[PDB]
Design a protein around this nucleic acid. Structure first.
Ligand SMILES: C[C@@H]1CCO[C@H]2Cn3cc(C(=O)NCc4ccc(F)cc4F)c(=O)c(O)c3C(=O)N12
Ligand SMILES: C[C@@H]1CCO[C@H]2Cn3cc(C(=O)NCc4ccc(F)cc4F)c(=O)c(O)c3C(=O)N12
Ligand SMILES: [Mg+2]
Ligand SMILES: [Mg+2]
Ligand SMILES: [Mg+2]
Ligand SMILES: [Mg+2]
Ligand SMILES: [N+]
Ligand SMILES: [N+]
Ligand SMILES: [Zn+2]
Ligand SMILES: [Zn+2]
Lengths: 368, 184, 368, 184
DNA sequence: TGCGAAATTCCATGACA
DNA sequence: ATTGTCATGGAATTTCGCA
DNA sequence: TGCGAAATTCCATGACA
DNA sequence: ATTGTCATGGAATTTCGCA
């Protein structure tokens, strides 16, 4: 208010206002002659209102807001008051984009054994083929061995039908999926409990987490496409061929086919490898155990120059999953409860529910 | 001569007619020769067509060098011969009225007939849903000759479903009267 | 054929087949004992068929195809025959993805004068507002000054109505747009010819090319969103406010508002800059000419480690614009006729039409 | 006293009634005081509401410090006063029956009345579509007092539409009889 | 103990909506 | 309460064949 | 002729479908 | 026949205030 500004007028020194400048009254307002020009020094009691008026013209950030204010005013530490308002503008906080990248991805250890972990996911809708529209894709974590089931809907019931057929062969310890309706239903949970199978779920809206199976989709569709060139897209009859073809394909980095990693010997398919012809099965299985453990494992890439990593207590915001037109892309700020790993956190939302969430669907709330 | 391996020989055979279950009447039975690993497929008939349809499912996972069968019509048809030739599978038949397998396979078949029988009593019509659990049981059953289950020999690991209860497999005197009832 | 393989059997030397290895007959086939094992050497007349069988199991690339062949065979220079087939597999060529990046982007010079170049584009459909669904956005190249017109359709007729209103103020030398139906119609061409306006078109399906205006969309929607928080999305009445707000917003890198760059003086808006109060208009206009020419210009970024740049005569493939499900993502190979600049080329397609096309919608055909 | 600048003063006025064109009857005329730059807006009436509606379009591009007008009802209404106050625009009225502008503005108004008249003959009803070309003509017309067109003064550049033909602007003896016909 | 060429390994790029 | 992946095809690097 | 802090500039990040 | 752009908000760097 007028208190501070008074001592200033009579030539006394206040902290913040540099002494080498001439401060005066004119038109009923305190002014100052700064290199760029003559600016009005408003009373402290006025400042917040000014910053807010300037910010609100176009809801601009630091510099663009400062540049408006600086046209008419000067006071000490202007940006600090600007930044204060930015951190309190709910509209800016929930609409603006982040300019901080996620920390570098984790490369989780390959499951130790076939059947330790299945990754499952749907593809579709595809062009109708024999009345079928979707494909359930099941990928064994350790081997990459993949099973394909045509379905009519991406439903629990179709999922259960297909997995009852597959689990005829073996039951897996874990099944990992995204949060599709088919996999999160209580019917499906029951189905898994009945078989001593643990259901593991991806953080929501983060298909990276199902990356083992997502990546297999690309190979499946790619081979379907090539096989279907210049023909109508009758894919249903080709699933078995594609399954067999991909399971017997070499991964150049591993130097093995997923079939090989699962069985330790090729079946009667073209170009079967014959290197273990003279070994006993037992000798073969022993060489397979060794091959399985010495497979290449990728490492966490370098962080980008401007990444953030979450810290317990930090204010952060979840990405709105499917935002309507002209609606904010971010939820209100929430608090990091637990850091499960550097890329995964539990947050308390403001409702407040606990939510387990990928760092990729988060931004650190700006301006503290 | 080279050691025996999985996929060297599949022994296939039909079981049935059975009481209808979800409209199915037969089980095509496939046993890997070296491992004792069993696959089961419900069919509506012991026809070449039901056989081709089932084996197409299996052969999208593993193709055997040789299929061994008795001289069932389904297996000796020229359609089935074409099917095998297309896939480079050699067909092999036991002489008529003299079924030869191997001890392992014969004993496996025995376990299957007995295990099915034990489970179809009380519920002769609900076998369709039991086929998965039958196979798991069969494939995680300890082999006295080798020290390993078919699962262990096929995949080279322990299973997450060990059937540590070596079962009665015999019909309790109760069920013997229950089975002698369904025939009335 | 059997010719070459004969001299080999009797211990004579043929180029390619290293001498330090034992070559022999067995089971009616020529064999050899290589460190990894005993492989069949097929006759040259057989090789192509083999490579093709192996490739066709899953339409695999170099290493994955080689690894199948190497299971049963050896001959000299196997990969060369594999690569030959890959370059002849039409299905692989049109389906596979590129693994070469585009060369680094151009930063074309800012137009020298206001009204030298307009960039135009539609946004929408938006939630209906007063029966309006789209916004025509017009951005002056040099100044960034933007005009917003609500429309009911992204049509020529609506475009003409809006531009007749705008060109009341001034006629531009050039209007740049993408290939939307509204801007490519003969009615619109006539409308521009009538006014001595040159129509410039982006290469197809490359919104980067309209980047001056595309980027303005984000600011427009962002401000609409903030203003509409917790209200129904009644945007029509806000266009004028948003237009005015954005045209008077500072760009921190330029230190000017687009209004300033267009007029050289703020109008009666909040926080008007007053620095030229004592100058004559003529003095003001002269300082404006100087400000206009000394604006920051970005430079072409560094190329990525594995980029390609087009060369006259090269086989290249256009990206399929809107590929159907299970259909190839690339057109058949075509030839680079002219290199307009390092990021833009004319190709002859195979029909053959001349097409002007962005390098971003191209891949260099693999395996020559 | 500070030099005159664009946006210091907008002079606004209505022209009409005119022959109806696409359902419009009047033109609101806005002339920037310093530059001579003209904006035209068709309206259905010289009402406060039609005025506010037109000026809202203009004031989404540039806001004048002062609006100058005669004492037309549209301009002296309290609604129009509220509108101006909201935008921080000072209103300014010439004394009744004594319209004061500036020479530049008066001469501009003159050019407008004369240019419109010349174009409405033969087509008194097609003026709506001509408003854009009228403004371009007006704003790229050379000012004898300054060496520059309103375009040049507003934007500080040459225009891509120079009207190098300084026009007759007088009605040829033919059109004088054509206009003296439409009044019959 | 070193050369030219082939084989193998590296790894950026893009795509699973 | 969880977590990217890996085919591809030139380039870089290593190994082979031979001396 | 050098210090601590403020101001200004840099620039990676993401988003215009 | 053509071509990315630029708000944002921490960090890096420069300039200010003072001695
Ligand atoms: C209705 C459920 C509820 C949850 O969310 C949706 C949407 N969704 C989206 C993708 C997707 O965007 N894949 C592209 C992709 C992107 C990045 C990457 F690293 C890997 C990738 F495969 C899926 O794959 C997917 O399965 C789902 C899905 O199931 N649902
Ligand atoms: C029907 C016409 C025919 C031609 O193609 C479509 C599709 N399209 C797509 C986008 C779009 O994808 N914008 C996102 C974006 C991506 C990258 C970038 F650098 C800048 C960006 F704005 C447009 O903006 C757009 O105007 C159109 C359009 O008009 N059409
Ligand atoms: Mg999914
Ligand atoms: Mg998916
Ligand atoms: Mg467009
Ligand atoms: Mg666009
Ligand atoms: N892990
Ligand atoms: N340029
Ligand atoms: Zn805000
Ligand atoms: Zn191919």
């Amino acid at each position: 208010l007028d208190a501070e500004l008074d001592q200033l007028l009579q030539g006394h020194y206040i902290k913040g206002y540099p002494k080498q400048y001439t401060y005066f009254l004119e038109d009923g307002k305190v002014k100052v002659s700064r290199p760029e020009g003559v600016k009005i020094i408003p009373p402290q009691s006025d400042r917040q209102k000014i910053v807010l008026q300037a910010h609100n013209l176009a809801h601009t950030g630091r510099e663009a807001t400062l540049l408006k204010i600086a046209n008419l005013y000067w006071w000490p530490n202007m940006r600090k008051d600007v930044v204060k308002q930015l951190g309190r503008c709910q509209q800016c906080l929930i609409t603006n984009a982040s300019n901080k990248a996620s920390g570098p991805i984790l490369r989780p250890d390959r499951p130790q054994k076939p059947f330790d972990k299945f990754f499952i996911d749907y593809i579709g809708p595809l062009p109708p083929s024999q009345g079928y529209l979707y494909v359930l894709v099941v990928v064994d974590g350790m081997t990459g061995f993949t099973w394909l089931y045509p379905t009519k809907a991406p439903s629990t019931s179709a999922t259960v039908k297909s997995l009852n057929v597959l689990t005829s062969i073996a039951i897996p310890k874990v099944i990992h999926s995204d949060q599709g309706a088919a996999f999160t239903s209580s019917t499906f949970a029951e189905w898994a409990k009945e078989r001593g199978i643990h259901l593991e779920f991806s953080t929501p809206y983060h298909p990276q987490s199902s990356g083992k199976v997502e990546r297999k989709h690309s190979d499946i569709k790619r081979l379907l496409t090539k096989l279907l060139v210049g023909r109508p897209t009758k894919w249903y009859d080709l699933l078995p061929v594609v399954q067999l073809a991909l399971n017997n394909t070499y991964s150049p980095v591993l130097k093995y086919t997923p079939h090989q990693l699962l069985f330790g010997i090729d079946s009667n398919t073209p170009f079967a490898n014959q290197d273990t012809l003279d070994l006993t099965r037992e000798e073969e299985l022993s060489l397979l155990q060794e091959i399985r453990t010495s497979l290449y494992h990728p490492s966490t890439p370098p962080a980008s120059s401007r990444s953030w990593s979450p810290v317990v207590g930090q204010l952060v915001q979840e990405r709105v999953a499917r935002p309507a037109s002209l609606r904010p892309r971010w939820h209100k700020p929430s608090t990091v409860l637990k850091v499960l790993n550097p890329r995964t956190v539990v947050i308390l939302d403001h409702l407040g529910n606990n939510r387990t969430v990928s760092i990729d669907n988060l931004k650190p709330t700006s301006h503290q | 001569d080279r050691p025996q391996k999985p996929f060297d020989k599949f022994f296939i055979d039909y079981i049935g007619p059975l009481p209808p279950s979800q409209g199915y009447l037969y089980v095509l039975v496939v046993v890997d020769g070296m491992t004792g690993f069993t696959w089961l497929y419900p069919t509506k008939a012991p026809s070449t067509s039901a056989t081709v349809k089932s084996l197409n499912v299996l052969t999208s996972i593993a193709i055997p060098k040789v299929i061994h069968s008795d001289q069932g019509a389904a297996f000796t048809s020229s359609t089935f011969a074409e099917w095998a030739k297309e896939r480079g599978i050699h067909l092999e038949f036991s002489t008529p009225y003299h079924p030869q397998s191997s001890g392992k396979v014969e004993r496996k078949h025995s376990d299957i007939k007995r295990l099915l029988t034990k489970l179809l009593v009380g519920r002769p019509t609900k076998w369709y849903d039991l086929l998965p659990v039958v196979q798991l049981a069969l494939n995680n059953t300890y082999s006295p000759v080798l020290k390993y289950t078919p699962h262990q020999l096929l995949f080279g690991i322990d299973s997450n479903t060990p059937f540590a209860n070596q079962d009665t497999l015999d019909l309790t005197r109760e069920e013997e009267l229950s089975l002698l009832q369904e025939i009335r």
